[PDB]
Design a protein around this nucleic acid. Structure first.
Ligand SMILES: [Mg+2]
Ligand SMILES: [Mg+2]
Ligand SMILES: [Mg+2]
Ligand SMILES: [Mg+2]
Ligand SMILES: [Mg+2]
Ligand SMILES: [Mg+2]
Ligand SMILES: [Mg+2]
Ligand SMILES: [Mg+2]
Ligand SMILES: [Mg+2]
Ligand SMILES: [Mg+2]
Ligand SMILES: [Mg+2]
Ligand SMILES: [Mg+2]
Ligand SMILES: [Mg+2]
Ligand SMILES: [Mg+2]
Ligand SMILES: [Mg+2]
Ligand SMILES: [Mg+2]
Ligand SMILES: [Mg+2]
Ligand SMILES: [Mg+2]
Ligand SMILES: [Mg+2]
Ligand SMILES: [Mg+2]
Ligand SMILES: [Mg+2]
Ligand SMILES: [Mg+2]
Ligand SMILES: [Mg+2]
Ligand SMILES: [Mg+2]
Ligand SMILES: [Mg+2]
Ligand SMILES: [Mg+2]
Ligand SMILES: [Mg+2]
Ligand SMILES: [Mg+2]
Ligand SMILES: [Mg+2]
Ligand SMILES: [Mg+2]
Ligand SMILES: [Mg+2]
Ligand SMILES: [Mg+2]
Ligand SMILES: [Mg+2]
Ligand SMILES: [Mg+2]
Ligand SMILES: [Mg+2]
Ligand SMILES: [Mg+2]
Ligand SMILES: [Mg+2]
Ligand SMILES: [Mg+2]
Ligand SMILES: [Mg+2]
Ligand SMILES: [Mg+2]
Ligand SMILES: [Mg+2]
Ligand SMILES: [Mg+2]
Ligand SMILES: [Mg+2]
Ligand SMILES: [Mg+2]
Ligand SMILES: [Mg+2]
Ligand SMILES: [Mg+2]
Ligand SMILES: [Mg+2]
Ligand SMILES: [Mg+2]
Ligand SMILES: [Mg+2]
Ligand SMILES: [Mg+2]
Ligand SMILES: [Mg+2]
Ligand SMILES: [Mg+2]
Ligand SMILES: [Mg+2]
Ligand SMILES: [Mg+2]
Ligand SMILES: [Zn+2]
Lengths: 86, 244
RNA sequence: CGCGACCUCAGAUCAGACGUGGCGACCCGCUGAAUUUAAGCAUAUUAGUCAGCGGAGGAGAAGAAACUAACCAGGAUUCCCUCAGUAACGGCGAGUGAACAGGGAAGAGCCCAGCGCCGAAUCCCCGCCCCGCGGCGGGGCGCGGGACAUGUGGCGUACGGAA
RNA sequence: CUAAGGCUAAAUACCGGCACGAGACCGAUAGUCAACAAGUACCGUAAGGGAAAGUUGAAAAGAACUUUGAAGAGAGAGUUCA
RNA sequence: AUGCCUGGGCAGGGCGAAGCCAGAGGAAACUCUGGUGGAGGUCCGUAGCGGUCCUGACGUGCAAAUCGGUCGUCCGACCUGGGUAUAGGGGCGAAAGACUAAUCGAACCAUCUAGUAGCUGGUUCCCUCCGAAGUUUCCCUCAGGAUAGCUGGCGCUCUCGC
RNA sequence: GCGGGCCCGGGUGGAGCCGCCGCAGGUGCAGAUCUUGGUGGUAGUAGCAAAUAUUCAAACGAGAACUUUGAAGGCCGAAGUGGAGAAGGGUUCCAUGUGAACAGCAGUUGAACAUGGGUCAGUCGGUCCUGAGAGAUGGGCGAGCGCCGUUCCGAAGGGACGG
RNA sequence: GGGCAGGGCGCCCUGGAAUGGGUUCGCCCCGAGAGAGGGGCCCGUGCCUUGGAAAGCGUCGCGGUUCCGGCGGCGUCCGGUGAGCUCUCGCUGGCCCUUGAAAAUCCGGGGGAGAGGGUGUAAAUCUCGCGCCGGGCCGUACCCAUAUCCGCAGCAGGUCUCCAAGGUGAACAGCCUCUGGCAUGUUGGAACAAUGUAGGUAAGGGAAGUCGGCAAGCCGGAUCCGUAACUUCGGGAUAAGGAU
RNA sequence: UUAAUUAAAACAAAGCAUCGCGAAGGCCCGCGGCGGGUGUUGACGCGAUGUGAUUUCUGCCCAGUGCUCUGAAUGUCAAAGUGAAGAAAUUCAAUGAAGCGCGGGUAAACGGCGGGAGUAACUAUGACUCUCUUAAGGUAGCCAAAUGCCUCGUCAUCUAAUUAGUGACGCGCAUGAAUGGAUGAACGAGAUUCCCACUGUCCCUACCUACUAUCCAGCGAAACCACAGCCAAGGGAACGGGCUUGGCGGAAUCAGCGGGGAAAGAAGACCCUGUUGAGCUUGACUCUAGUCUGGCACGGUGAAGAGACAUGUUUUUUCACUGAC
RNA sequence: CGAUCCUUCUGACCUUUUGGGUUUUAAGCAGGAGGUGUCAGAAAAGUUACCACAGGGAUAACUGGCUUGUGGCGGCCAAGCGUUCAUAGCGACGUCGCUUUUUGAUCCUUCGAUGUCGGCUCUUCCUAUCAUUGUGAAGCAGAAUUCACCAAGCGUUGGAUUGUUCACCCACUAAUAGGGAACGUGAGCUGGGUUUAGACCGUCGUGAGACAGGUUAGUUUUACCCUACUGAUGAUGUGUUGUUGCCAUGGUAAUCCUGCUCAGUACGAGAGGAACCGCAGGUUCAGACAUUUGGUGUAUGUGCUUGGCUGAGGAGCCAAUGGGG
RNA sequence: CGACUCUUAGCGGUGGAUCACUCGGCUCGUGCGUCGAUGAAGAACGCAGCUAGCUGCGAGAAUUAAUGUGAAUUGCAGGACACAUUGAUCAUCGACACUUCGAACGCACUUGCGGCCCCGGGUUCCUCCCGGGGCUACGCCUGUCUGAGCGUCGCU
């Protein structure tokens, strides 16, 4: 009864998609993620799981804004200027 | 090593009172100028049954002598109180049943209910189903009055605190046998999750100090000190005497 | 019976700014064990270590003696060698364990409160004019506002200072 | 020596980030889990767990065309040094 | 597993508690007879819920617990959906150390951690030379160590069929 | 060559390799219920046996016990093997085509594969309300991320009529 | 929408009743006003009518090779019953030491703060009848289970509901049938050896078998009789035992 | 009620009996707070236990361990405070809370409730009597019980035959009164004995049906495998398929079968060892939350009085106020 | 009779007590004591049947091995019993042996597992012979009885009680003899009792818990591999086929009882009471067969019937073989 | 001689071992050492003629502008360009642009409900309605405005 018969009545889900980390870990009743802790301002991470930190770190994503910062620093963060016109 | 039953009642969330259908706290009328000096009249509208409480309650409608509005209070109904009856409350209120007035005014030997432990707490003593308190003596000096509680103890209280004349309606419930586990289940379903009680000797020695053993016995004296840590204070707590 | 100053305290979609989170190899402040060793184990050891929390920068922290020494004295802080597996600590068992001087890398010193003298001699905000304004400054013109005597600025701080 | 007030670069550290150089190091069961659409596929409700997988040929010149079979498949022919 | 909130559901029959009507007896108290009535943590029994026996089938199965007959209960301490609360030395338990996602006399995940083992197992080419002990003493010592003993290697000091 | 192994002949192979003097090591396997990958006997064997049942003719088709059509015989026998929903699934729904792989035989069939198509709201529901409960501000605690609590140590309504 | 049946009233007017009466399956009611008359209100999901016969359905005959949502004649009728099943409405009771939700939202009433035009007009219409404009966003396919979900799978397991015909029969029991559905449940053919799994039957004995009547078998429904010990007087009880 | 070996006599249950608490309280949660549950509560309530329908009864014991009551008549008693001498660090002395000692209560608190001799005109038993002892020495009841080693106790019944069953006896290893005794209608998928009927359980087996097994077409694994597989005796790690001596042995197979392969599974669940652990208990060793008590600070104002030192100081006892709380 | 560490005492005009000097205190140097009885010297209570891990056949609970104390069985001498008489039948006090069908001693194999006590079923073997066949001896007159020899061919039963091995009783019989085969036999069965987890009683323990003390409920997996066995095709040679046969080799099978006559005879005082040859039959076992009797029965053969379905009659069908002759 | 079985060899199958290759790792060292309310890290959804994944991009969505270079991209068509022209692709990148969540900011997370101003459709501001644009979170500093107090004071 505790085995195959019990697996039949898994009808209602307890987790949904979190809107901050995107993972299916948002607990419906507690309204807490447990993967990133969305209601908490700070992101959830720990030093006892280094692989988890490596999975979601700065280099993993798009880096849409930081990649431009790298080149802008590499040239000198110049603003409001144009190259010599032809 | 497991936490015993009785400690888990403090946390709650399973032993909390069932207050879903309760009609409200049965508090006496608040003290005001009319109560303190004269008296104010109210009209009894209906007598209501409060789940989890043997004694019936009575809804009494007053009028606020500061704003144009009708105040409503939920008193504990005394024996003989009927609908459409005028009930008075104040220092000058007369000595009739279902009439709340200070104990100092009432003469000795008066039977009262819903007695105030402190002046202005709106009723705390002798209000269960049919219990009543009796005033024994008055002390004009220091404004003190002696009252005998239904437990048999005599307590000294201030003369300012009020009480309702008469006994609490609905007495004699304990005379009728329950006769069934089902009736006990229905009775305790409206109060708490505490009715099905397992004996400590019938438990394992991990969840109760009285459990364990090849014979269903206690093995230790049932009496325990009042200065005992939680998880051990079971049985007869600070028993002066034990037997019949 | 109202108004006018002050002191404490609120409201703002009031004017102009600031903090929030991320990373976290290196750094700073807390909290903080048990595996293990002692052929067992409780003090010890593991170990101010891992785990947990908070806070920055390109470095951080520290830093110019309420010092070291007892010598014919040295002279901020930081790091390297040595001191030294030493003094010392420890069921004085297992084990733990620095500092001074010496040789180097580098080397940089200073500022307030108070004490007192100068007519608050001081500072912030808004208007106009001139320069440049893409890390919003300088000067001048404003009986235009505010802060400040419950103390701003100049001289001046232990190596003495002021007249 | 003058505590209970404050500031300060250099010699110091840097398994993260940006851009370079090198090796008595390994050579696809090795070297990072990941030489390849790898934190990907996939597993668990979740915290998390987590792979396998490089090589035609110098050049596709990648087998026109004939024939049996419904086709998969063959027999000839052709390309290429193979 | 338990508490709470909001919904849904439970054929057909038997027995016949109060209350009520009529008749008969009585001096009264009241008592008999025949009806009506439908109460019961009532009975047989279906759906539902559960799982006693055959210790049947199966037992690399349909199935990491199912199947056939036979069974207990079936208006109440009843069965059930959704929402919500209680989280690991904690919860919950009509109490079996039972349940807590196929794990419960202390769940799962990652780290400390390559935890420790006097205890098992394994330990990779050839040839040549030498070649053992299971014994003394001490140890919370008896499946182990230290220490003497047995072994090998490296030499050195000398004598000589000179 | 005692041996560890080595030198030539032939074939395949197509691009690097070895001897000697020294140096260095992640340097020699038969076992560890060793790790990974592959392959045998078993073996064309166990098995393709829970719930009564199929038959005839024609059509398409290379191919028919399993497709379709018609006829006959059956079962589920309104608590159904019928008709619709909720949770869940997420294109599995519909039309056309293929038969590479899967549907433990086959298939001309499919929930397989490849192309396209399909979900039309004021009235049907979400949206509104509150229940059990959860959870901010004020307040308190906490080294700290935060926690306690939902009226309790609050100047808590920015609304309205009439003038 | 309008009208009318049919139910309910703890609504009203005349009047005062023992020789008590009215009345239900049961109850219950009456000088705090019963029977008898006359009214009023609520629901009217039922019947007639607008909608609406124009449409739908069953028949008979055609237009058009085809496309073609067509054209037409007819009918869609009259009655009775039932502790019959289901749904719904309404009265009446029984049980609780159980008394069986909150809020949003809508409405009625008590008061008269105030407005109106002044003798034909106005302020007002919890708007009386029409007339004009708008109603945004999200989901909508299909399966919903011996094959579309969870069990590694087209797994004999598990998974919340609604609709509910005829016969027999107490019955939503079992069996047969109609509407609807399907091909026998991951294959077929040929024989009927032993062992099996699932059903049975056995002369005479009747538990002698076995730890043990395990398993199987016996009785079984209804009607008419009858029913003991014991007892908490309620039961035992379908006791047991007979006939049809 | 132990999902997946135990549905029961186990748990629960109404009834019965005790314990604590009148709110700055009882029980409990919580690292923390003017925190929280019971509690929308108030002794006919809440919290903690034991027993377990109805009837009857509930015997004795406070010696022990618990629990509880008061008590300056008080032995021991820490910190802080007071005095002493010393140059001081100091040590000594006096004072001295709770708790332990001391004194009562309580067994429906945990629990317990003996032994040796003599003695009635046949024997036997034994009324009755004596001694030692504890806190009483088992009272009413009941039994060879679910409880009795001897034991298959003794007698009767039930059978032709009974270690079974029932009914009586008590001598009870080791029954017994809310750790409840006895009884008891109805009920029980609870454990046993006998009887009626019934039957393949059996004497003693046979036959029939359906699906398998069988053969065929198609599709097709897994466990296991040092090498393999005919025996007798011998020796051997004391029970060999292999070795020795003998008996002997002939391709490839099919359907059964369970003697052997000390057959397959799981680094034996039993026992022992380890200076290996875990659940639980306590009169084991170290501790700890909580809790009781004393001192210091928050901690103020007024009015009376005494002791002690000394010839102003401390301790301060009581009463009164509120502005802290 | 006692190490380190620690404490304590004793001794020096002893050293240090750190910038110097004095004085207390403290630390050193040397010698005694305070003690470790597990005595070359840890500070240390239980339970686990809810249990876990690493191992051990270095170590227990089986079988099997050595031995035979013990158990069982058999001899040697002959004091005596036997009315007389040691040896028909027995046999003390002593002494010599055999078996491993009893319990013991040992720990040799097995703890990376060899499934245990009984019962049921089945085969074979031993003789230490209960009965039957053939015989010897008597305290053998007949009958009966025991002692002994060749001898295991064929038999050694049905039941009440108990799980039982064992044991006791009832009945029949010629007899109801004793044993082995891993204390034969669980991929042959069952699970009744031991022997996990749930519970009850009694004793013990403060307690968790323990009891060769009782009670109750408690999952028995897999063969399709090799061999062995049971059957079925087959195989090497005979030139190929077929018919009729022989035979080496293996297996082997029949057993016991009753009645009549003998004969109421032999024998015997009597009571009682035989045997051989013959006749009629029975028990157990083996090999066959269905004429008869019985069983089965779906030839689904033929009637009879319940409910439903083809409109009804007729003829039929469905209800896992509808039911019944 | 058969079939089956055993050893060896040639060839043919299953398998991918060995060797040689390597736009990848590991280790050491040098310089620099830069995120975010002017909206970070991360996530979601979309963007190509034919486009699933990877990579790149953000409704200006396989890239816009400018600078340098100078004739392509390419799997196929289509082509823009005259490559004597800012002129195809590339690299640089300083201008512009940059959807929705997310410290995430009107209230909650359904993509649901709102308030304060301006413009247009409708109007001829008239409020309903529709579309577009800008605001509306917490804490905190300076300053401004409006306030309260039986807080401390002064005049009447
Ligand atoms: Mg228990
Ligand atoms: Mg305990
Ligand atoms: Mg250790
Ligand atoms: Mg060790
Ligand atoms: Mg240890
Ligand atoms: Mg430390
Ligand atoms: Mg600093
Ligand atoms: Mg220095
Ligand atoms: Mg040195
Ligand atoms: Mg100054
Ligand atoms: Mg790799
Ligand atoms: Mg079974
Ligand atoms: Mg099987
Ligand atoms: Mg237990
Ligand atoms: Mg290691
Ligand atoms: Mg050892
Ligand atoms: Mg040598
Ligand atoms: Mg040698
Ligand atoms: Mg087969
Ligand atoms: Mg059927
Ligand atoms: Mg359906
Ligand atoms: Mg389809
Ligand atoms: Mg197929
Ligand atoms: Mg009337
Ligand atoms: Mg639909
Ligand atoms: Mg299927
Ligand atoms: Mg079938
Ligand atoms: Mg089929
Ligand atoms: Mg028979
Ligand atoms: Mg039975
Ligand atoms: Mg009876
Ligand atoms: Mg179970
Ligand atoms: Mg069971
Ligand atoms: Mg008690
Ligand atoms: Mg006592
Ligand atoms: Mg019997
Ligand atoms: Mg006793
Ligand atoms: Mg007892
Ligand atoms: Mg072998
Ligand atoms: Mg076998
Ligand atoms: Mg082992
Ligand atoms: Mg040891
Ligand atoms: Mg331990
Ligand atoms: Mg136990
Ligand atoms: Mg051994
Ligand atoms: Mg003997
Ligand atoms: Mg004779
Ligand atoms: Mg045996
Ligand atoms: Mg066997
Ligand atoms: Mg078995
Ligand atoms: Mg058993
Ligand atoms: Mg047990
Ligand atoms: Mg005891
Ligand atoms: Mg007929
Ligand atoms: Zn998240």
């Amino acid at each position: 009864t505790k085995g195959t018969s019990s697996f039949g009545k898994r009808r209602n889900k307890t987790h949904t998609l979190c809107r901050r980390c995107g993972s299916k870990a948002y607990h419906l009743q507690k309204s807490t993620c447990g993967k990133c802790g969305y209601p908490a301002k700070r992101k959830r991470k720990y030093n006892w799981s280094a692989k988890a930190k490596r999975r979601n770190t700065t280099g993993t994503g798009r880096m849409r804004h930081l990649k431009i910062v790298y080149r802008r620093f590499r040239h000198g963060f110049r603003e409001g200027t144009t190259p010599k016109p032809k | 090593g497991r936490v015993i039953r009785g400690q888990r009642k403090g946390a709650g969330s399973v032993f909390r009172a069932h207050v879903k259908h309760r009609k409200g706290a049965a508090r006496l009328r608040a003290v005001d100028f009319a109560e303190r000096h004269g008296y104010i009249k109210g009209i009894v509208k209906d007598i209501i049954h409060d789940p989890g409480r043997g004694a019936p309650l009575a809804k009494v409608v007053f009028r606020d002598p500061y704003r144009f509005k009708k105040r409503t209070e939920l008193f504990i109904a005394a024996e003989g109180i009927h609908t459409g009856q005028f009930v008075y409350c104040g220092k000058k209120a007369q000595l009739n049943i279902g009439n709340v007035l200070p104990v100092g005014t009432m003469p000795e030997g008066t039977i009262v209910c819903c007695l105030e432990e402190k002046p202005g707490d709106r009723g705390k003593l002798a209000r269960a189903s049919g219990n009543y308190a009796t005033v024994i003596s008055h002390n004009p000096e220091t404004k003190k009055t002696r009252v005998k509680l239904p437990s048999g103890s005599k307590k000294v209280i201030s003369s300012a605190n009020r009480a309702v004349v008469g006994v609490v309606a609905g007495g004699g419930r304990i005379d009728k046998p329950i006769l069934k586990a089902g009736r006990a289940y229905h009775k305790y379903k409206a109060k708490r999750n505490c009715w099905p009680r397992v004996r400590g000797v019938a438990m394992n020695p991990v969840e109760h100090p009285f459990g364990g053993g090849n014979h269903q016995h206690i093995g230790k004296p049932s009496t325990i000190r009042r200065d005992a840590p939680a998880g051990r204070k079971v049985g007869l707590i600070a028993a002066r005497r034990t037997g019949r």
